[PDB]
Amino acid sequence: MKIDRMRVFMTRDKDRPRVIVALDTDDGLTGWGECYNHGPDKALPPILDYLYGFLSGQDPTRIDYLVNLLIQQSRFPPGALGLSAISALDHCLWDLSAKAANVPVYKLLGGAVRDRVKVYAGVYTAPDAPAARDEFDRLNAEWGFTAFKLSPWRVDIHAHRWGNVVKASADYFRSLRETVRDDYEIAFDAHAQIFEPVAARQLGNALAPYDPLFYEEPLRPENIDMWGDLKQGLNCVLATGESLYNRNEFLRLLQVKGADLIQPDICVVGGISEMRRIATLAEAYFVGVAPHNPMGPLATAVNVHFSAATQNFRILEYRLPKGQAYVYGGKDIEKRQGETRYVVDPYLPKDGYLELRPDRPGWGVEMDEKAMEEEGYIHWQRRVPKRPDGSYAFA
Amino acid sequence: MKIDRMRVFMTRDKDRPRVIVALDTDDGLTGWGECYNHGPDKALPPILDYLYGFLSGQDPTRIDYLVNLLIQQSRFPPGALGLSAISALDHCLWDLSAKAANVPVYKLLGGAVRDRVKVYAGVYTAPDAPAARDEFDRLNAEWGFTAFKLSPWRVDIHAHRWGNVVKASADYFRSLRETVRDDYEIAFDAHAQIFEPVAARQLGNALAPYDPLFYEEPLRPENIDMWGDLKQGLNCVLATGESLYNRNEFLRLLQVKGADLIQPDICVVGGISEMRRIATLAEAYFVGVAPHNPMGPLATAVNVHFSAATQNFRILEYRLPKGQAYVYGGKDIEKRQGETRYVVDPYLPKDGYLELRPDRPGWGVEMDEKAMEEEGYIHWQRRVPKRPDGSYAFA
Amino acid sequence: MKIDRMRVFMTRDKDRPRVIVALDTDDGLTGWGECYNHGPDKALPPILDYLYGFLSGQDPTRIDYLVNLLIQQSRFPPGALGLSAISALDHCLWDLSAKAANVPVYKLLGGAVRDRVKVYAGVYTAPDAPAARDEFDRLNAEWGFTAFKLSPWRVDIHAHRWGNVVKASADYFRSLRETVRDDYEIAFDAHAQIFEPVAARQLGNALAPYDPLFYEEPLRPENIDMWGDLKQGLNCVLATGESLYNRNEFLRLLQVKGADLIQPDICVVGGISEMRRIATLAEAYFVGVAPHNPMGPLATAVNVHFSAATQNFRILEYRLPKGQAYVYGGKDIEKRQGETRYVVDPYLPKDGYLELRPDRPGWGVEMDEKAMEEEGYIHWQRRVPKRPDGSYAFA
Amino acid sequence: MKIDRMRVFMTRDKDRPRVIVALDTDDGLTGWGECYNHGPDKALPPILDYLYGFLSGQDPTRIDYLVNLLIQQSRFPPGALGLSAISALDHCLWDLSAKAANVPVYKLLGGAVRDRVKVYAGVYTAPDAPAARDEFDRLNAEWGFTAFKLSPWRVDIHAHRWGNVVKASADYFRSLRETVRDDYEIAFDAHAQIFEPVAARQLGNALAPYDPLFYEEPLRPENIDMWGDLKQGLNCVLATGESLYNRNEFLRLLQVKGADLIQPDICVVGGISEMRRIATLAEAYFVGVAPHNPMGPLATAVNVHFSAATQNFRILEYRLPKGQAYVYGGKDIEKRQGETRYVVDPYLPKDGYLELRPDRPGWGVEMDEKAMEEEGYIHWQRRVPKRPDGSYAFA
Ligand SMILES: [Cl-]
Ligand SMILES: [Cl-]
Ligand SMILES: [Cl-]
Ligand SMILES: [Cl-]
Ligand SMILES: [Cl-]
Ligand SMILES: [Cl-]
Ligand SMILES: [Cl-]
Ligand SMILES: [Cl-]
Ligand SMILES: [Cl-]
Ligand SMILES: [Cl-]
Ligand SMILES: [Cl-]
Ligand SMILES: [Cl-]
Ligand SMILES: [Cl-]
Ligand SMILES: [Cl-]
Ligand SMILES: [Cl-]
Ligand SMILES: [Cl-]
Ligand SMILES: [Cl-]
Ligand SMILES: [Cl-]
Ligand SMILES: [Cl-]
Ligand SMILES: [Cl-]
Ligand code: NA
Ligand code: NA
Ligand code: NA
Ligand code: NA
């Protein structure tokens, strides 16, 4: 069969816009993909239009052939917007190829190496311990979650003495351990807020006695080598990688021993074609994979198949389709709610895992095209905090 | 003063599209910038629209403050499209600030450290030596050029035995030295065609006895460390960097001794704000700067000011406004011509140098807005070569 | 315009001599600079006389051109006295160029990236905790200081058992935390007193639990590599660099991971031209800048502009114009007072920050030339301590 | 005995000024020293006045005690001017101590390890081979020289194509080997002219087949680590170090394998106290010492004693007291002559060696104080070349 149409939908995932892509073939199949929301998502349709010129008329079962062509046409490493678009197109190709062969996507990835896919709940705030307990218990009752990710920050990190900032985080984690179920796993996302390796090490070592599931992305991404310096003398599990794009950025991170767990995003790195390369590198270095996934239900489905097939996958970031809107930080349980509607039958956890749908070819979800037409673009931007001197710090 | 409007022009530079940006202020000044042409340039206006939200109402003389805000809003390192847009906005801010202070831009960069700016002619093909001689001599008579850049490739590198490919390049360079003026400098751009460090070393060492001005970008960009391996045992000057984006990618290249000369592009890396950081790093490592510049006359003007102020600048890539259309490779002098019209009074070489315009504030060129309205978008894409087995190689 | 006169003033800053330099132009402008006080400051005027030969008749807006000429004429790296003189001349050139363009100096440095400049109070002694509290509170009430720098040494380090020396410092810091405001930041300057990396590590790790803002310059400067050894296994923030001169000494410090925060002095390294290079290197290595500044009000003004423009600047060392004379160490609040008078309108802190003067071109201070004529040279020398065996240790 | 007076003489050594220092004692002895001529030599007397405060009344036989006190009072590493002054004072102390003990200085340095001291003639220009032959033969007949140092540069290195610059140097060395005596040794001083390690390597390897005695100081001094990169793949003996100041700068050079032969200057590094430390480090690294010495006859005498006592000393740079004035480069035999008169009985070579004077205590030369009063200061400065674009390069 041959690719013969692309359809691009500008929709939304609660308060963030979301570009969803379909590739159709001349034998009546359609594959679907989800772009990461970097910000200026109105840039994605013209990128997709350009990339489609290289896919028109091609055999979609030549997945890596076509994805690599997209990379090479670009020539410059694409980074954010270009790779987001390539990621969705990669997804479409895997989906088409799986549907052509009448199999779930994981059968094109070496088969399922696990029966279900562990998730943690993206909570992202720093609620007082009793409120945290109540929210964790609610999520546990409904979906079986026993792992959760919070912000460690209990004060403005630029407006208080650093020792007091760190003590507030340590005291907070202690209070959580005194309050919530003893089996619950709690990760902390420091959200690339910290400039100095030594400061990131101090915070990690203050959290370490309370067993963080992982300590995520404390530093900025551009200097990879400094991550190896951070990790020397660090007593907790260090995770990073959402802000890294390709096999080579991850290779350097691994070479310098800059992480214990890596967190590529399948909507950021160029889809499964690149995600699998990255995970294979990590596997040889004895590093696990916890995919980054604050994206929507189609992205979640793509992650299910990748995760099911990857030996060194450990746990998947997860946001409920109906539930909390996007947030980072704050001493509450986020009040803003929303419902993401572009997937009819999203993967929902049962007993803390997403479950395979082995009798459905492709991703195993149905798209709601009417819902996508109903809800269009919404502007979204990050908050870049300021220091008291008026300078900008880091989002 | 405050930024109060952005105007975005979709125009062209011969056969490549070109997005030109103006930022206007409430005291009637305008600054101008040029985006790199990565490919899908219809993506640039929506990126610019989004970024402008962070510039509206701001003091344009806070250049690094605002450019860094654009970087931090993005959070993920932007790479190609995002940084191209940021680059043009950076240019606009320097131009506005210089016009506000009634000085040439170089006076905002520590002042001029040279009186004029050496250029080499971007020829880019591999013409037989007599034709090369004639073209070099024509360019020398008219503009004073004594330095030129060619392709080294005299055959399809994937369809002949490698030893014969390299011998053809060495024989070619020998024939040029037997034919053209003895003082002419000749650089070779291998155009990121070669996969293996050892192969790149073999070619460089075959060219070395004939004194290439530099041997440019032989390998792909993603693995930075392999460049240090290439350069060990390399007998000629190695240049690279057009495909690298920021201070940290260049820092690693420098740390591994991966180049003797670096070639960032001021329309790719985020403009002068980043270019200066990159050049400062190189300077401390005793590495020169030969800016990448296959872009148009506004980009050339930006480069004039950066180059004039930077001690370790050596030579600037240059394409005539009226002349050869874009090309890489081929055993001729490119027949396709064009005229780039969006600058009224472009910098033209005299005796092989671009000359400062010290009595003109800002970049020192006038934009032709009517010309920009007259010539709009044109589709352009790279050629990704195939091997005889049907696989895709590298553009 | 052209430089057409130099005027050199031998004056003083309380108990230390101070050479202040003016460069005048033929269009009636004057730029001002401040030399570091290394010791034999009567050597500075003849150095300045010699250097002026290279500046006479030149365009002062070619700042880096001229400063680099001074460096290259010297050929040998200048170190202390030569670079002190070059530093003041660099200051004069930035000041002239800013006045010529009618802007504050920070507009020549990429613009302001913050609205005001955080300072810490240079206290420098080791007063008992109640006296420290009272002094900190006085400084806080008057100027808004919330950050202070002390000596850690509570006994003669060469006349007591080392474990007892370190315990005395740790007990002291504990007593300060039990006594002073919980938000106050306290740095310790070990003043290059310690010979052995292991000893410096032991002291730093004894201070670390009480959150030193930074631990400054514990070792001697000549062996840069040993700083990387010190910092391995060090649990507090390490700062150094006042005794390092140029981009390359700082590059090595950064390469070996020898500091978390660097402290170049703008009167020592060759002024802003070199300071900016050094800060750019540190920025790429994710290292902050806390400029060294025990110098006077003109030096402070130069620092204001540099600090305002530099993203990775964090905090500025500050001594009041009217207040404590120079001191290091001792278990009191220094009794010796003085008043530095060569600046009419010095930058004074408000709420713990120095404030920009955006409507004043140049540094934004007026020099008191009559005051400079009134108070001339005073002899000053360091105290080099002895060990009980009669040997000399380190100042 | 106690030091009780210092006398400072501002005199000259042909066309360069020279500060000569005497320290007198209360038992009627005098020791003598020579400062390097960095440039602004009127700065030296006030430095000396300040340093003398630490020597007055002291026992001059405590040489390292006092020299280290001078270093520690300075605290900051002194670099050029400060160390030049310290160097002369160090010389004075060795001379006094040797005279007090009635021995030649070498008996205070572990004794003579050789009977005489090999010298090479500092010629410094690049004369055509027949003229070189004639000059070498004249110097050989008169003084027994069989080793000579030239400039390699036969054209302006910034105004010709680099391959042609290097070829001119190689052709030149070939012509010398075809013309001069087969046993003559010829060194080349590239005079810190070359920016790029790769370029320095290319030139060295072009000279290598003709056996340069050494290839001196091709690169700039500030980045020490790049010297290790240069030397990797270099086929000739590499010498450097005149521009390095202390045991630690030399330690790093040695650690990176940045030289085969080191060239500290005994008037630059702080005299014998530091020179011996530097030479001991080099000895353990299996690196020889060829002291830098374009200075005058007193400096030469100091070098005789150091060289006589140092096992890894190889050869000493030498300029005749009556003969060629200071020069670097040029395609002639320097026409400018002069006579240096401040030493009555300077060391002159016999059969290519300086000869010990074992029956004379101290340095073994008499100072001509009347000559020093007769000829005073003369202004001298370096030539910093320009490139054709108007930028400054390197002296
Ligand atoms: Cl992109
Ligand atoms: Cl459960
Ligand atoms: Cl807060
Ligand atoms: Cl489900
Ligand atoms: Cl992007
Ligand atoms: Cl010509
Ligand atoms: Cl072919
Ligand atoms: Cl073939
Ligand atoms: Cl030539
Ligand atoms: Cl022109
Ligand atoms: Cl100096
Ligand atoms: Cl307060
Ligand atoms: Cl004591
Ligand atoms: Cl004790
Ligand atoms: Cl606080
Ligand atoms: Cl004030
Ligand atoms: Cl000095
Ligand atoms: Cl002989
Ligand atoms: Cl010439
Ligand atoms: Cl003699
Ligand atoms: Na995250
Ligand atoms: Na290129
Ligand atoms: Na200090
Ligand atoms: Na020399």
Side-chain angles (χ1 to χ4, degrees), chain A residues 351-371:
Chain A
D351 298 318
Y353 303 85
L354 304 182
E355 302 201 312
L356 305 180
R357 301 169 177 191
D359 296 323
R360 298 181 68 177
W363 303 126
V365 297
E366 177 195 10
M367 305 303 296
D368 192 332
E369 298 178 37
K370 181 178 174 55

Side-chain angles (χ1 to χ4, degrees), chain D residues 154-157 159-160:
Chain D
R154 292 279 289 173
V155 299
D156 179 349
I157 71 172
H160 297 93

